[PDB]
């Protein structure tokens, strides 16, 4: 019943500033012992950066010493992360998380979904979506593959579902690859019964928030 | 200040097998008899999930197959019997001193029986061709192990430096992987050739498998 939902992710100019927010639901921020931000560079690895205690005490990882401000708004049931003088090193998925009243406090049982922050001089570019049409050459056994090619976008990430999330079984959405152009390209496929290709409609729903691009492609 | 080192960095194991992962701190995380080491599980595209707190306590709602032990500077996460849904990166985290720190993560894969790829190939769309480029896509579906070789051939010329591939994480459904290779060419180059082939070599195939098509049926 307690969810952490985050906003403020996206493209940021090197030297610029970011402002993340974690909106708490099903729980009062004031009841929390601790609220936190933890980031993870795409490469991998988790890093705690900041915390605010229920009394308002703030704490920061020296790794980002003096360019961070954790704060909260009790009437909004929300807390915030602000950083400035952003470097490429600051590109990471940023997670909010709740600490505990028990057992040393500083372990996190509740997290938000995370938001990606990309620090780059490049500009946003929405993707093109092309069909990956079923064929006899995509029908090996009594089962056919079709998909969508989400090509030439920046920055990450892109969201891909099928039939408005109604079709999950057999769906593979691949990790984006970075092209020599500096743009990202990604494919999503779904294996389905070849006997339903004539009677069932298949729509991949593509979302790229950074460019405000949404596409629904029938294949 | 305070450095945690896990081992191994990566491991692969048969379903049901016991799995143990080590965490070593640079200083003690002991305090009032309690040990402030924690363990997280992170599945792809997900926030870390807390498994163990205070070295040995099972977090509510986590399966009993996961357990923690240790104290001072030596800590152990164990999974009694590895389940398919257990593929993930596992982290240890000390909560004794600020700058709260994590281990580098241990990657855990389920080792299943060999399963050969199902290969599919997709021609460029006319929609894309009008844009001046042609992407050809090859799909290798549900295979194990992860390693696979994909060769692109255009009228039997081996293409190199011309394509990119991506591999899904392990699917818990059946412990396989999938892989997408995309061959990119100019429309001009695409229109000038006929035979587009995707050749695949995998441990599960006695010999390579080639899926192809001829432009004019694309």
Tab-separated table of N, CA, C and O in Angstrom, chain B residues 153-157 193-197 212-215:
chain	number	residue	atom	x	y	z
B	153	UNK	N	25.544	-12.313	-43.580
B	153	UNK	CA	26.077	-12.445	-44.925
B	153	UNK	C	25.113	-11.802	-45.900
B	153	UNK	O	23.897	-11.988	-45.801
B	154	UNK	N	25.668	-11.026	-46.824
B	154	UNK	CA	24.902	-10.364	-47.873
B	154	UNK	C	25.482	-10.798	-49.212
B	154	UNK	O	26.641	-10.511	-49.511
B	155	UNK	N	24.679	-11.505	-50.006
B	155	UNK	CA	25.176	-12.216	-51.195
B	155	UNK	C	26.478	-12.959	-50.894
B	155	UNK	O	27.416	-12.955	-51.697
B	156	UNK	N	26.523	-13.572	-49.713
B	156	UNK	CA	27.652	-14.383	-49.261
B	156	UNK	C	28.907	-13.605	-48.896
B	156	UNK	O	29.978	-14.189	-48.718
B	157	UNK	N	28.787	-12.290	-48.792
B	157	UNK	CA	29.885	-11.506	-48.254
B	157	UNK	C	29.664	-11.412	-46.754
B	157	UNK	O	28.593	-11.000	-46.314
B	193	UNK	N	21.725	-5.661	-53.594
B	193	UNK	CA	21.994	-7.061	-53.290
B	193	UNK	C	20.726	-7.875	-53.068
B	193	UNK	O	19.651	-7.334	-52.801
B	194	UNK	N	20.861	-9.187	-53.172
B	194	UNK	CA	19.694	-10.050	-53.202
B	194	UNK	C	19.583	-10.923	-51.962
B	194	UNK	O	18.521	-11.002	-51.347
B	195	UNK	N	20.674	-11.589	-51.607
B	195	UNK	CA	20.607	-12.616	-50.577
B	195	UNK	C	21.066	-12.095	-49.229
B	195	UNK	O	22.230	-11.734	-49.054
B	196	UNK	N	20.135	-12.053	-48.282
B	196	UNK	CA	20.433	-11.584	-46.932
B	196	UNK	C	20.288	-12.718	-45.933
B	196	UNK	O	19.186	-13.204	-45.682
B	197	UNK	N	21.417	-13.144	-45.378
B	197	UNK	CA	21.443	-14.306	-44.499
B	197	UNK	C	21.959	-14.002	-43.096
B	197	UNK	O	22.844	-13.167	-42.900
B	212	UNK	N	17.576	-17.032	-44.150
B	212	UNK	CA	17.832	-16.038	-45.187
B	212	UNK	C	16.565	-15.599	-45.898
B	212	UNK	O	15.497	-16.167	-45.702
B	213	UNK	N	16.688	-14.565	-46.718
B	213	UNK	CA	15.589	-14.167	-47.582
B	213	UNK	C	16.141	-13.449	-48.801
B	213	UNK	O	17.275	-12.970	-48.785
B	214	UNK	N	15.349	-13.396	-49.865
B	214	UNK	CA	15.748	-12.673	-51.061
B	214	UNK	C	14.927	-11.410	-51.233
B	214	UNK	O	13.702	-11.463	-51.261
B	215	UNK	N	15.615	-10.277	-51.329
B	215	UNK	CA	14.977	-9.003	-51.621
B	215	UNK	C	14.104	-9.190	-52.855
B	215	UNK	O	14.581	-9.664	-53.885
